[PDB]
Structure formats: C-alpha cells, structure tokens
Symmetry: D2
Subunit: 248 residues, 4 copies
C-alpha cells in the first residue's frame, strides 16, 4: 500500500503545493485546514479524481490552548483512520503578523504565533512518534537571523521550531524517524501586501530577482521525505535564492 502524509495548513499556497507534490509522488494525503474548508475539500476532490480515496481533510485550530494537545492527537489519528498508517508529517501551518514591543490581546498573539509555529508542531511530533521511511518536515524561515522589524513573537516561534527540528531529530533517530526543515525566504507574498512593496522584496533576491514559487519549496520537501535523503536528519535546507546572504 501507498504511504500516507499529513500536511498542516494544506488548503492554499505553499501547503497546497506540498500536498499535491506528495500526492503526485504517490502518497495518500491528509489536508489539514483551519478556516479554508472550501479550498481544502476542493483540493481533496481534485486529488481524489486522480486516484479514488487518496485524500481526506481535517479541521483544527492550532492556536495554543488546553485543547491543543487533543486536536493534534486527532490530526494524526485521522491519517491512521483513513489510511492505516502515517509515514510523513509536514508542519506547514503558521500564523504570521507584527507584534511591536513598543485588536488581539498580547496573550492571544502569544497563543497563535507560538502555538502554530512551535507548540503544535511539538505536539503533532509527539503524537506522530507515539503512534508508530518515516520523516517529519518543518517549514522554517531562512530569515530567522535577520528578522522582519517588530515580528519578535513570530520570529521566536520559528527559532523554537528550529530547536524542535534538532531535538526531535536527536531523540527520534532511534525510531528511524528523520526530522528536517525547509526554510523559504520570500516565496509567495501575501495578496494583502502592496505591489510596490512586493517588487522591493523580489529585487533583493540574488538568484533571479524573483520569489520562489510554491512548487520550488515543495521540491525541497519531496527530496527530504525521499529515499535519497535517508541519512539526512536535523538538517534545514534554505530555499531562498541567496536572500539570506545579502547584507543590509
């Protein structure tokens, strides 16, 4: 039987590309979502039209709370429910917005940014491991050491996620579970963002003066979960077209 993968925030953009490429490679997928029900099912329909009963959806808020552990336990369960196995976990879901040091309460910002980018990936990892070419891939950020201004919580989240990638690689290696990361720089920009401000970020990218397509990010994910990366663990692959190498 075909292996099975969980992709968090898989309904749109980069997570959608991961789930599609994983499916095109022959995985059965769990498309997690929070708000994008319509887009998630739409993706599942497309994938299932290709091969019947190879894509299911799963809803969960990934914000930190007393219920988070149980939601993450159940995302992993849905993969075992649908497919009888869970070979791959891609922690892609992420909140990202500014939290100046000098309207959500700060405690809610903590809950969303630290929960989605860090704690939920920790809890999903716990449940993944407990339930067992098994690997985990975490969507990190190649700009962590040169962070966006006023983004300290988000940024604290992605650093926490780098530490979890490393800790979990060390601890889960005895179980044959590899744990790795993929770090975009500028991939798909928010439709929210202004076009002028978009081309400002694009022009900074040495390799082609453009952003990464979502497929380019998914390519790194595909490599990491493959047989070609079977000695690779605790590694984080930058996919940033040299953006992080560029001084101020």
């Amino acid at each position: 039987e075909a292996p099975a993968a969980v992709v968090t925030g898989a309904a749109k953009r980069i997570g959608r590309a991961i789930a599609v490429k994983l499916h095109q490679t022959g995985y059965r997928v769990v498309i997690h979502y929070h708000n994008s029900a319509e887009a998630a099912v739409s993706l599942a329909d497309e994938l299932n039209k290709e091969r019947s009963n190879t894509a299911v959806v799963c809803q969960a808020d990934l914000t930190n709370s007393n219920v988070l552990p149980a939601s993450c336990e159940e995302i992993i369960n849905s993969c075992f429910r649908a497919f009888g196995r869970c070979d791959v976990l891609v922690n892609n879901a992420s909140a990202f917005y500014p939290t100046p040091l000098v309207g959500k309460t700060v405690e809610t910002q903590v809950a969303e940014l630290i929960g989605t980018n860090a704690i939920a990936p920790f809890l999903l990892t716990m449940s993944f491991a407990q339930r067992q070419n098994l690997s985990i891939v975490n969507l990190c950020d190649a700009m962590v050491d040169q962070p966006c201004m006023a983004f300290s919580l988000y940024n604290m989240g992605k650093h926490a996620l780098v530490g979890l990638t490393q800790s979990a690689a060390l601890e889960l290696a005895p179980y044959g579970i590899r744990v790795n990361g993929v770090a975009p720089g500028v991939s798909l920009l928010p439709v929210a963002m202004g076009e002028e401000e978009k081309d400002k970020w694009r022009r900074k990218v040495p390799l082609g003066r453009r952003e990464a397509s979502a497929e380019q990010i998914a390519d790194a994910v595909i490599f990491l979960v493959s047989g070609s990366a079977q000695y690779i663990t605790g590694s984080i692959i930058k996919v940033d077209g040299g953006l992080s190498l560029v001084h101020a």
Copy 2:
C-alpha cells in the same frame, strides 16, 4: 543617583551572583523570586546591610497564562516603585526538566518551559521598554542549544526562542538606545539533586579546566554586557562554556 536592575529568579545560584555583582557595581536591585522566599529575603537583607535601601524582593510566577503579561508589567513596576528608574533587566529565571516525545500535564510543561524561558522575557522586555543613560537587557541563554540534552525538546525550544527574542529585541529597541544581549553558560552550577558522579561526568567534558563555570564567572559576562565597555554591543550572545560546545560526540 544609582541605577537600578531587575534580575529574575535572583534568590540563589546564578541569578543571586548576577544580583550581588550588579550590587557591588553600584546598582540597586529588584530580586525577583518564585518559590524561594527565605533565600530572596535573606539576600535582600545582606545587600541592604551593605547599602541601606538598595534591595527589594518581588514575587511572581512566570508560567505562561493570560495573566502573565500583568505579572511581568508589575515586576517592572516594582523597580520604578522602589527606585524611580529601571536601567537593566536580566532574564535569568528558567524552568528546566525533561519532556520526552515518547505527573504534570503537557499543557503545564508547555506553560512552564516556554513561559519562563521565552514568553516572560518577551513580556518583561515589552514592559521594560514601554516604561522608558545606559539601558540594556541580558538574557540567560544556553551554549548547548544546538547540541541539546536528550528529551529536553520544550526547554530547548524555549532557549531557541530566547535567542530569537534577543535578536529581534536588539534590532527593534536599538533606536530607543536599549541594547539586548545574551550570556550562554555551558555547564555552570550543577543541580542540587544531581549526584557527584554525574556532575564529574559533565565536568570532565569541559576543555578549559575540566570543571563547571562558577556563578561569578557567568555574572562577570553579564556585568561586562551592561557596562560602558559594551556600549556598541547589541544582538550578541556571549558563550561562557570553557570550550564545551566545541567538543564533538
């Protein structure tokens, strides 16, 4: 007027060393504590006997909660209440224990490990800036963050977040003249519950001396980072590990 510092978890060990050294340097100190009331009060006694009206104690739980912001805001408030100013903040307080991936609830482990090592520093940092000359923050990090102990995922994630904060905070608060730096022990004072055999196993790994760092040795680097000799230093983590992080498996 003498400047004033806040040191979190300052009742004993390394935070005591920081507070004492900051006090010997001429600072007034808020000794923040959680459970260690007698040790906190004993230390504020010692320091006030040295210079009257120069040490207070301040109780707070730094576990993450929806009341954490308020608690951190009050820690900073207490320094202004006592001393009319707050020049320096040392984020020393830290919970530290295993959380294996395979009777505390996981929700509580998240709250204590992430709260003490990362969210309280963020919140204290926020409160410190908004209440505002040589202003600086020093975060107690960990030199072994990239070669972590087995099954310390949460603690390690919180120390990594602390590195992230140090950097983001240094960047954002530089315009306000606040510097933000770190001090990363490898092995310093070992746990009180640890047995001497297990301590010596760690001691024997340190290239420089085959011994742990003293609390004064850690405190020395913090005192450098707050001084006028570090006036251009920000976003920097100073490793104080006797070469331990260079030693391969």
Copy 3:
C-alpha cells in the same frame, strides 16, 4: 545534448560515487585525480563502456603554489576540450591529516590542506564562471566544522574557508545563473589507515542507524543540488550526517 560535470578527486571513495551517479543521471564526466591514475582510468573505462565518449580523466596536483591557478584553469579547459561545455563543478578533492599546534614541513601542510580544501575550489570556481541551462557548483564541506577533531586546525580552517566560498560565490555568481551550494558529510567512508575500534567508536555516536554514510548517500545530495528540483537553492549547505553534529560531548 548531455551536460558535463567536473568532479575533483573522483578516482576513489566519495568522489567516485559522485561521478558514477552524475553519469547515470545523463552527464558526461571529467574524472579528476592526483595520484590515483590506475583507478581514475579504470573508472573512465567503465563509464565509457556504458555510454561511449562520456568520460575522461584529468591529472592535477591541487596543493597551493603559484601555478595552482593555471592547473585549475586547465581542469576546466579539459571539460570544454572533451565535451564542448561545463555545466557542473563538484569540489570533492581534499587533503586530511592532523597539524598539531604544539616529515612534512609546516609550509607544505599549509599548502596541501588549505589548497585542496579551499584555494583550489576558489580557483576552479573562477575558471568555471569565466568560461561561461542549469549551471551549479557543489562543494564538499564537513558537518563537524564547529566541532572539529583535535589537532586538525589547518584542515578545519580549510573547511571553514570553503563555507565562506560557497556563500560568497553563491552571492556573486547568482546574476550569472550559477548556483553554489554545499553537502556536508559527518562520518561517511572511514579511512583505510584507521584502526577498527576507532571506526566503531565513531559509528556508535551516530544517532541515525549507528552507522556511517555510504558514498552513495553523500552523492544523492550532490545529485539533488544539481537537479532541476533545486533551481532556487543557492548558498545552502545540506548536512548529510545522520544527526551526528547534534550529539553533545
């Protein structure tokens, strides 16, 4: 038409697995060697037996000297002479031996270690770029560069230099469509000379499988980096170390 690749030190061990896998992927290969004449010619034969006119050998000493630029210019020239193009450069050749601080002269050690591991890669990158599709360079680095073996400073200085090259070359050659990246083994193929308890000592330390990387596992990452699945990857060093660099002392 088939693209072509240069692999330094490709007669044996890891560079040989690299050249074999490039060739299976469809590349024509220049097999560079220094002393391993017999092995190099044997490899070209096997590759050519499989697909005709797809492999040449090229001899060069990559020790630093005033003629090293010319030699490196000639290794790149040999690919154009043989195949009409040069698409891929792999910097694999490396001297590796201890150089304690406290019968080769120090002048020679500096020359072999820094030349093979850094200066030759720099000069090759220069000639490659100047002679100029999916063009890319992969340098063979070392995952233990921050946790070096004792008394291996010149070697370690060379590997660090190689990281600096990867990044500086990635930045500068980006506007030319040339990507530059790295593959950093931990313990892979273990030395001929090394005793057998030393090998098992190193093997026990590897979290993932308690074994060293096969030559082919290292080559897989090189192959990924030069493929059309890495078109946005530049200035990245991929560890292929079974988690070894994560194990504390």
Copy 4:
C-alpha cells in the same frame, strides 16, 4: 612583574587602539607593523614616555610564503627577548580588497588575503603556544555570513579565522590558553572614503547610526584578555551595533 602582549598591525587604527588600551591596562606591548614604520615608532615613543621600556616595534610581512613561519616565530621571539614573557597575542593585521570571480596576480591575492587573515594567525598561534592568564584574540568580522560582493578571498580568510579560533580553543585549553574572537561590523572606515559613502554604511547600523570607534573594539579585547573572562574560550563576540541582524 608586568605581562606582555603582541599586537599585529598595531601602528594605526583598530590595532593602535588595542595596543594602547592593553598598555594602559598595564601590559608591555610588541607593536607589529608592515609598512607603517613611522606610526609604529610614533606609538612606541608615546607609550615609553608613559612607562620606560614597555613598548617595542617589530616589522614583518605576513603574506603567505615559505618564509612566513620563520617570520611569525620571530615576532613571538621578539616579545620574549624584549620582555621575558608573552602573555597575550592579538591577531589584528589584515589585508582587505576585492577579488572578483569574473594589478596583482591571483596567487598574490591568495597569499596576501589568506596569509594575513588566516595563515599568519595560525603560525603566530603555533609559536605562541610552543613558547609557553594566557590568551589569544583574533580580529574576525561580524558580516562573515553576509559578505561584501566580490570579497570571496577576504571572506574565505575570515571564515578560516573563525575555525582557527575554535580549533585553537579546543587544543590549547589544556595549556590554560584561551582563544577568542572579536567581530566588528562597521568600525573605522577608510579615511579617503567619501563621507557620503561612509554615511551609507553608518545608516545601516541599528545602534546609533554610526560605526564603532577603535576604542570600542579595543574594549571587547580588553574584556577577553581580563580575569573577568577566565572561563571564556572559543567565543566570538560581535561588536556591531546590530548590523548583522539587519536584512537586505
């Protein structure tokens, strides 16, 4: 009796600041120079005026060659002959210039950039140790991982120096010798650089929109060689005003 320091390229700018602060701390100093004999001599006189017989100068080209090892052995030897001891070694001398990938020969650029920045520090280290609060301090570069364009050989030099620092810390720790680095970001700008170009770099620095004075860099070196840094080794202290944290 008073301890003694060797400082390389100590005649001008940053190295001169380091020599002076060491001397003010109570060190006797070997002022090394290559071309700047008048400034070296000028410093030694100033310093000997303060304290009789506490400053000497010592000339040596630090470009890589087959005589380099002998030259570095003689710099160390000069401190022993003059003062009877060599407690501190500061590796400050640095060639710095572009070497684009696409009127010196390239082999000479290699020899100057790699020799001054990396090989001479390694030979000076060998000799320092062989001859024995003992410490070495290397002048590194905060911008090593975000290099200036077309500075690959310089950048290769500074990276090697980080590795030396680490390798030397580990190997000389049993002899009680600590090895550390100080990494400037933007410090003293070349005097002949136009103020308008100087200002483009200044403006990039978060902490105060200015470059570090030489004395500011010297301050960190002073720290590292003091009794206040006695457990510190293998460490590189950035002195950069937050410059390296600033994204493109």
